[PDB]
Structure formats: structure tokens, C-alpha cells
Amino acid sequence: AKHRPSVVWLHNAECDGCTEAAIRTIKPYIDALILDTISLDYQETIMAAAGEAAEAALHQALEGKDGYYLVVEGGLPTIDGGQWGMVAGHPMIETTKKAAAKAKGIICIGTCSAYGGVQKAKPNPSQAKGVSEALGVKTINIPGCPPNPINFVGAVVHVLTKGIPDLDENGRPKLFYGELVHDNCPRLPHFEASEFAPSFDSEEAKKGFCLYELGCKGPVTYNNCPKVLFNQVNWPVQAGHPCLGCSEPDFWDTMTPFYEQG
Amino acid sequence: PTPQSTFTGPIVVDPITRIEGHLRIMVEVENGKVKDAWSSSQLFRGLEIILKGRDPRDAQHFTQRACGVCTYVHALASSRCVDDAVKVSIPANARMMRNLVMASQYLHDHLVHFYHLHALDWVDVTAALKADPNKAAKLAASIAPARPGNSAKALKAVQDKLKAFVESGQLGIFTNAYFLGGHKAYYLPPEVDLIATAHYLEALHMQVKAASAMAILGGKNPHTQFTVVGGCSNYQGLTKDPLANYLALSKEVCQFVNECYIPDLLAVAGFYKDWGGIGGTSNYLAFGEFATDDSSPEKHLATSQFPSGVITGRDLGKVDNVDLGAIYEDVKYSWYAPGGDGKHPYDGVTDPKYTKLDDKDHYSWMKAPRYKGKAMEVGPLARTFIAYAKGQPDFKKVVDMVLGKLSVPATALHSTLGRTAARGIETAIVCANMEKWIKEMADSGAKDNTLCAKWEMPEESKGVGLADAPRGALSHWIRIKGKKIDNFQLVVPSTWNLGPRGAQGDKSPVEEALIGTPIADPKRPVEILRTVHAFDPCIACGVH
Ligand code: SF4
Ligand code: SF4
Ligand code: FCO
Ligand code: F3S
Ligand SMILES: [Mg+2]
Ligand code: NI
Fold it and tell me: Could you tell me which residues carry Cysteine sulfenic acid (-SOH) (chain B) (predicted)?
């Protein structure tokens, strides 16, 4: 039996959209990944053990002789000593900090873990922070809300088989985040021609005109959405809707109002 | 009879795994039966607080991140909510498209719940290694439809895969499972455990198809991006080739539901017949879904094809209309400031105030929604009871098949078994309607492709969006002042089902449903999981 690298997956202040995204992988499918490629040793959404049994399973993984990689889903709520976000009676910040100390590598799946995400948006009642901020360590960021599984699984496999991929200024692998959404958008011709839809009911909209005047944040958003699509079928602009800039840090605050450029 | 220990004392399960989000369950057990319970949600994010002062058009994009499991449903509720507040009536095509995406969400969500979140409470995976694959193929010929995935060779292949995994010593998501070594509360024959495990692996693939279908209309999954105030943006979803694909993938998913999901559920149901006497509650509420007229909340309530209603004290003879002014939320036993009890959502207050772990006076981040003083169970079981009481043809037929197959009375459905069976019942019904709903949108779209209506932002208004999401009655409530969000409150199915006690000290549905739970082995309390999971808890939904 060839040993499979242990992966510990933690869920902090999250919506589970990133877990959901990960299991949409088809190259390979999630079963082949976990049966053949990695040893997924802790994952709250799907793991059989619960309660103390689950906590023990976590403890065993963190103390495995071969070490482990850490995946983090969700931001970290820090108000009141971290007690607004707890698992097994422990603040999420404390367990993540513990798990990160000895990780071979830390991958942040999603804008939440990467950058703080929706719970951090003003006025940030929970005082949520991104992982890199909260722990004081560099993380490999796979943002989007959620990211494409191609991006997360590709990062994971890259990390286990080649090393750390090249990262931009915001910690994102250039392999997937090196290009602006807008630069690969099929509407770009309309944008260069100043052919904007003024509203969603307009003939312009019906004709597939550019969605810039309706708030599209493609021009300032780094992601591969139009190139790889989602679910092998679509992406937001192809479905007639502006990009929200959901792979950008603090986009909840920097890209809003979503339906404007102001 | 049902395995039961003599155990007396407390049990805490934290985390509850195989749910969305962060839940701690505390119970008091007496002579191996739960005598008291507390449902303690462990995370606060505060979307309602975050939304204050923002563009109402932005609400749907924030609220959809209430949860990624029941993705879409919040963006739908928000969009319904703002459409009401601006008094726009969406075009027929947008009603159709919005409702079809909801249908696709049911299919995806329920498949994943049964197999990947719930089934490990009833299936001992490791014991599948004991099964004979020929004997399992024969048995499968007798609990379900013929299919190649159920042949002996197919079942040997799953068995070999599982064997090499277990012998590797890296058990992964199975580490420390409650069924390791055997467990008195696990009743299936190894032959059934093999079959269910086979389908568990198949389901992991099939859900990718179910999501693909949904993304044809929704733009992407998770977190759709096709709804706008006044309708939908996705003109391409009204067109032929994308719809033809949507139909085709939806047929494959529905083939799996009929071939695997429903027979798997029924077999489990026959083995665990005793669970028809555990975990019941009394009051059921639904806002309905799949309406033919979604021009207003009043029209939604009235024309939902999965009907809306209120049942009280298990009385199937008196299905009441929903009184939307009668809903409120308490916070007495929640982690919020004093002064917050009894608030209609339009007057909703979210003022967070944490005390300490297991403080019996304040033990959850969920508010406690009540209806005229009463707790209400929401979700598939509620929808099923309401539809059955109203003689909705499809519910009648399929409920009857189940009761006829299980040889149990309809009353047996007020239970964790029924809660589980209801989920599958409605999946098979949505499946039966997909081709009709699809054909109605393809024809309509071809004739005229209107998809979004003109509207105007009011200086001052209020509005409510209703949906019956996979986990039940969802409402979003907005107050607009100065063309901005003045107040925005979410009341979510998980809040109804798994919130704490209300202002009167009265247990929520999950807490009541836990009363009388037998615990065969206090070290491995799978029975708590069976019931909790049957409610399909979503704590991120619940608390937001
Ligand atoms: S990044 Fe988005 S999809 Fe992922 S956990 Fe955060 S809110 Fe959910
Ligand atoms: S729709 Fe958005 S991404 Fe596409 S061309 Fe226009 S601004 Fe750029
Ligand atoms: N279904 C679902 Fe999620 C919950 N509870 C929502 O709304
Ligand atoms: S909203 Fe996000 S998923 Fe892609 S199209 Fe824009 S970066
Ligand atoms: Mg609320
Ligand atoms: Ni949810």
C-alpha cells in the first residue's frame, strides 16, 4: 500500500460553498481523489465520526508521523476571544492556529479563508479576518465564492507533486489567476465598441451586449471563469449577469454596489 | 427490540458532522433514553447587520452566501423579496426559470443529503467487506430495478476498492466511525451495506450532473448568478440546445433517483421500521413552492403546486392558511441582547450578545421562530403532510406507494423515519414533473423571450420573499428607507427546526424530536445523529 499524503480540512466562518465546489471536480472525481490520491483525514461535512470521535480523528491527523497539509474553508471570527465561532468547545482561531503550526502547506479555499470574505464585510460584527492575517503566516489562496474546483484540485495536486506554484501579489496561483476575467470574455468586442446593455430587459441585453454599464467587475477581477467555465457548462456573463469580482480581496466592500461602477 | 443501554447522564456531540455548519447537541439521558435536549448553534456571521444601509439590489448576492449547500435559495428569496417591495411582477418566463432552478436544487441537495450526509448513520461501510457479491447482486434484484451498476461484477469492484482502502490503514473520512467494530443500532445485512456503499460512490458522480443541469439555467453552481430584480438575466436559458441538455442531464439524475435513491431509502426503511416510532413532532408549516402565479406573496401561497399550509397537533383534517403576520422570532434563549423577543421579521432585531458555553439561559446563535406561540417543523415532511392532507394527486399516489410498501399507517410518518422518507418522496415527485416544467418553459421562451420586467426603486417600501427551500419554509423581509436597506431579516428553515427554546421555554422541533431517543451505546450515540440528520440541519442558513 503506497502512503497517501494526509490532508486536514478545517471549516471556520464559512457557508460550505467551497466544500460544495470542491466535490464538483471531474479530473479526477472526488472519490478517486480521496481513495487514490490523498488521505482526507478530517472533513466535517462528510466524515463518519462525530463529537469526541471526530475531534480525536483530528488529533490523530495532526500527530501523524508523515505530517499533513492543511485546507482552510472560512474566515476566522476574532471578537470576544474567538468565541463566536467554535468547534468542540474551542475557538476556531485557536484550532486553526494549532493545525497551521505543523502543516506542510496551507491552502485557503475560497475568498473567505483567503481574505476574510462575506462575514468581514462592513461593519464586520464578528471581527472576521483572513487566515494569513489571523495566523501571521503565508497561505496559498484559491479565492472565488466559491473558486472553480479545477483551481482548487489543480493547486492541491500541484502542491503534492511539483511544489508550491507561482503566486501573485495576493497569494493566488498565477496558473489560474494570472488573467483578468474581462480579457477572456466573449463580450469584449461589445465593450471595445461601447455597446453596453442599459438594463436587463433591454434589447441590448437580449443581444448579448457588454454588461459593464450594469456593474460588471470583469475588467478588474483576476480569475479564469470564461476560459474553463463552471460545471462544464456556463459562467455568470454567459448567463447574462455581471461579474461581482468575487475572487478579489474584500470584494464585498470594494466591488459594491454590484450593479454600478461608482 | 430496539437496542437501548441503561445509561444515565449527559451526552454532548460537538461537532455534529455531516451537516452544513457548526452545531453542538447536548442531551440528558435517563435509563438509555434521552429525557431533555438543547440545540446549540456555534457560529455567528451577521448578514442582516452587514446588509444595513446597502443597495437593495445587492441583497441577493450577500444573502446567497447565507449558505452554499442550499445555494441559490437565498438569492431567490431575496429576489422575491425585493420584487415585492418594488411591486414588480416578474414575466412568466422568469417565474418558470426561477422555479426550475429551484427544482434542480432539490434534486441535487436531496441526493447528496441521503447518501453523503445521512446514509452513514444507517449503513456500516466496513461490514460491506463481509458481503458476498453474488449474494448481494441477487438481493439487489429484489429491492430495486435491474441495472448494470448492481451486477455482481460491479459490486465486487466497489468491494475490492473499499477493501484496498481499508487495508491501507488510512481510513480517511471513516476514521473512528461509530460503526467500526460493529454497533447494536446498525441493523443492515452486509449485502445491503455493499449495495448502499456502491450507490454512495455512484452518487458522488451523479451529483456533478445534477449541478451541471442546474448551472445551465443558473450560470454556475455553487452560487447561481442569473436572478435580477424584475426577473432573470439568462436569455440563453430560454433557448433550444441548452434546454435539451438540461432535460437530458435531468433525466439521468432522475433515473438515478428512481433506480437507487428510492429503493435504498425503502430498504433502509423496512430494516429500521422501529424508527417509525421515534423522533416525531406535531406542527408543520410550509410556504409552498413551484407556484403558477408568483406575482405576489399571496399568490405564491395560493398557487404553489407543492401547497402551503399549517397543520397543528398532527391534525391532517384542518390545514390552515399561512398567516404571514403571525410569524415572529424570540431571543430569550439565544445569544442576543435582552428586549428582542416577539419580533415580526419586519421589526426584526439582530443585536449579538454572547455569554458562555452551555449557559442554559442562552445557548444558541439561532433565534427561535414561533407561529402564534407555537414551534413549527418545516421541510419535506411538512410539505408532504400538507400536500397529503389536501389530496395533492402526486403526493397522495407516492405516499401511498411508500405506506403500502412499508406496510405501515400514515401516522407512522410523524417520526424520524417519516422525515427521512418524506425527503425521497418529494424528490421522486419533482423528478416526475421535470419534463412538464421544462417543456412549458421551452415553448414559452420560443414564443416570446421576455425575461425581466421594468421597475422603479421606491424611496420607502417593505417586502417579503417566500420559498420552500429543500429544508423548508424560507422568508426574507425587507424595509427600504431612502432607497436603501433599512432592515433586512432572514427567517430560515433551519431556524424553525433547530433554533433554541422560545420565550415560553418551549423546545424547538429538533429538541422535541430528540425526546425519547434510545441510546444503545453512549460512547457512540448514532441515534442522536439519525434524528438530527433527518432534519437536514444547516447552521449557516439557521444563524446567518
Ligand atoms: S468563499 Fe464564498 S462560497 Fe466559499 S465559504 Fe466563503 S462565502 Fe461560502
Ligand atoms: S461583460 Fe464584463 S467581462 Fe465581459 S466584456 Fe463586458 S465588462 Fe468585460
Ligand atoms: N434548504 C435550505 Fe438552507 C436551510 N435551512 C435555506 O434556506
Ligand atoms: S463573480 Fe466570481 S465566479 Fe467568476 S465571473 Fe466573476 S469571478
Ligand atoms: Mg434572521
Ligand atoms: Ni443551507
Answer: 538
Angle at B228 between CA A219 and CA B87, to 5 degrees: 145
Resolution value (Å, 1 decimal): 2.6
Residue A182 is assigned to a ligand binding site: yes
**Residue A94 sits in the same domain as residue A192:** no
Task: Tell if the CB–CB gap between B168 and A47 is shorter than 8 Å.
Answer: no
Cβ contact B69:B20 at 8 Å: yes
- Same domain membership, residue A221 and residue A188: yes
**Phi-psi region at A171: left, alpha or beta (left = phi > 0; alpha = psi -120 to 50):** left
Name the residue range of residue A240's domain. Answer: 177-261
Is the distance from the beta carbon of residue B68 to the nearest atom of ligand 1 less than 6 Å?
A: yes
Is the Cβ pair B235, A240 closer than 8 Å? yes
- Candidate from A51, A56, A61 with C-beta closest to B13: A51
Q: What is the CATH number of the domain that holds A83?
A: 3.40.50.700
Rounded CA separation A111/A18 (Å): 9
A225 is known to lie in a ligand binding site: yes
Mutation to probe ligand 3, out of B63, B70, B110 (largest number of atoms < 8 A from CB) = B70
Q: Examine the domain organization and report whether A181 and A63 are in the same domain.
A: no
Q: Is A189 exposed, middle or buried (0-12, 13-18, 19+ CB in 10 A)?
A: exposed
Q: Number of structural domains, chain A?
A: 2
Ligand 2 atom at minimal distance to the Cα of residue A218: 3
What are the structural domains of chain B?
1-544 (1.10.645.10)
A85 and A137, same domain (yes or no):
yes
List chain A residues with CB under 8 Å of B164: 1
Helix (H) or strand (E) holding A22: helix A17-22
Nearest one of B81, B79, B109 to B94, comparing CA atoms:
B79
